[PDB]
Write a protein that binds this DNA or RNA. Structure first.
Ligand SMILES: [Ca+2]
Ligand SMILES: [Mg+2]
Ligand SMILES: [Mg+2]
Length: 430
DNA sequence: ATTTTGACGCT
């Protein structure tokens, strides 16, 4: 009752660039705009692996992870842009730099947590308070929310998508109590106004469109963001949670898409997030551990406390390459040459990072996979990263991994290596 | 033969 927390203390948004690598390539090459197109890495093996797909091409069934040759079977007019290749490997610099463009714009509005190359959480609580004080009891016009969906509306006593969107927004705004500045629904609504402004600024200043979710925590904001894509934003209120979760597969909630969510489904014999409400906190802790159990107990009620962390920059800078099938590295010279390629890309990115961001990495992590091992990484070792020098870093990585070679032959490497991975970590201010 | 990333939890 009067003491039960409701998780309505913050306004949190999640902003997600639509088909991001595709938009970067479409901005650069106008011939690709408004066409079925995809971004592909490499080209020799089956036309290359697709890593991003425009919504026009998704309509044909083209997906990420698909080989371009197969996608062309679904979509014969599919246009393709290739990721740059440098030093023998795919090089993602263009997309990292485009990401910085967008994150710097978002940071003008509020504190952001970089969640991936194309998405960030936004803590809007303070910005909403200030905007509410500026408004001075003035109602919020639908014109301030031209791309916003209110999840769960319209309801109760038009057959077009935009007409439905507007009907629901009208019902929401008609019900709103705009004179209580502490009202969580009003706070979410002002948050959505700010996110419309943020998304307009991103599009004006970069050309890139994005979607967004606005709710009271990160998990609900992330879920909301996916409800109406592309180029739209969705407000998920606390009150919408019971209906939304009542048919929501557990795997759709962030962190439950893998083994833990599978165990929740199997052990409890349920399918939907809302079904979790029927268990006590102790029951859930008994099955899934103290932390996970408490988290699930709160989350199925719409409540999550994970903070938006103030972190706009990645914590690690890494470079990796797979060597599948017959290309697995089987000689020492091969291993050393590719460690050098990876180390040279790493040195370039690290020097740029030091100049831009006033920090230096202090640890070098070396990871390899051996042929036959099902795990993505077979071995991980660390060593000191004391100089931004590619020859030193590659020599050090070889030193820490050279004892993995079973081969009694000096020149040969066995078992063959199917993956090399160098990662700079443990940054310190510089 | 997806590939190339990135963050965080466990012990
Ligand atoms: Ca995206
Ligand atoms: Mg995606
Ligand atoms: Mg994303």
């Amino acid at each position: 009752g009067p003491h039960m927390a409701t998780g309505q203390d913050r306004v949190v948004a999640l902003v997600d660039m639509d088909c991001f690598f595709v938009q970067v390539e479409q901005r650069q090459n106008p011939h690709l705009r408004n066409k079925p197109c995809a971004v592909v890495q490499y080209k020799s093996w089956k036309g290359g692996g697709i890593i991003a797909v425009s919504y026009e091409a998704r309509a044909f069934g083209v997906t990420r992870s698909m080989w371009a040759d197969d996608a062309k079977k679904l979509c014969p007019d599919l246009l393709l842009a290739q990721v740059r290749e440098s030093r023998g490997k795919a090089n993602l610099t263009k997309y990292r730099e485009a990401s910085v463009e967008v994150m710097e714009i978002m940071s003008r509005f509020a504190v952001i947590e970089r969640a991936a190359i194309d998405e960030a959480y936004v803590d809007l609580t303070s910005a909403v308070q200030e905007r509410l004080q500026k408004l001075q009891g003035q109602p919020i016009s639908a014109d301030l929310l031209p791309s916003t969906y209110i999840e769960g509306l319209p309801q109760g006593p038009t057959v077009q998508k935009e007409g439905m969107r507007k009907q629901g927004l009208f019902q929401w705004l008609d019900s709103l109590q705009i004179d209580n500045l502490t009202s969580p629904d009003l706070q979410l609504t002002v948050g959505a106004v700010i996110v419309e402004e943020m998304r307009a600024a991103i599009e004006r200043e970069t050309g890139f469109q994005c979607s967004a979710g606005i709710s009271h925590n990160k998990v609900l904001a992330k879920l909301a963001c996916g409800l109406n894509k592309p180029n739209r934003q969705t407000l998920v209120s606390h009150g919408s949670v019971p209906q939304l979760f009542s048919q929501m597969p557990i795997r759709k909630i962030r962190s439950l898409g893998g083994k833990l969510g599978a165990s929740v489904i199997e052990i409890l014999g349920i399918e939907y997030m809302g079904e979790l409400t029927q268990f006590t906190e102790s029951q859930l802790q008994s099955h899934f551990g103290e932390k996970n159990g408490s988290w699930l107990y709160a989350m199925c009620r719409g409540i999550e406390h994970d903070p938006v962390k103030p972190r706009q920059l990645p914590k690690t800078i890494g470079c990796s390459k797979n060597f599948p099938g017959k290309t697995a590295l089987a000689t020492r010279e091969q291993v050393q040459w590719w460690l050098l390629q990876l180390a040279q890309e790493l040195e370039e990115r690290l020097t740029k990072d030091r100049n831009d961001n006033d920090r230096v990495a202090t640890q070098l992590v070396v990871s390899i996979r051996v042929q036959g091992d099902k795990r993505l990484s077979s071995l991980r070792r660390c060593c000191a990263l004391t100089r931004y020098d590619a020859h030193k870093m590659s020599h050090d990585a070889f030193t820490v991994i050279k004892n993995c070679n079973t081969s009694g032959i000096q020149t040969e490497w066995s078992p063959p290596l199917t993956m090399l991975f160098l990662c700079a970590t443990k940054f310190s201010a510089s």
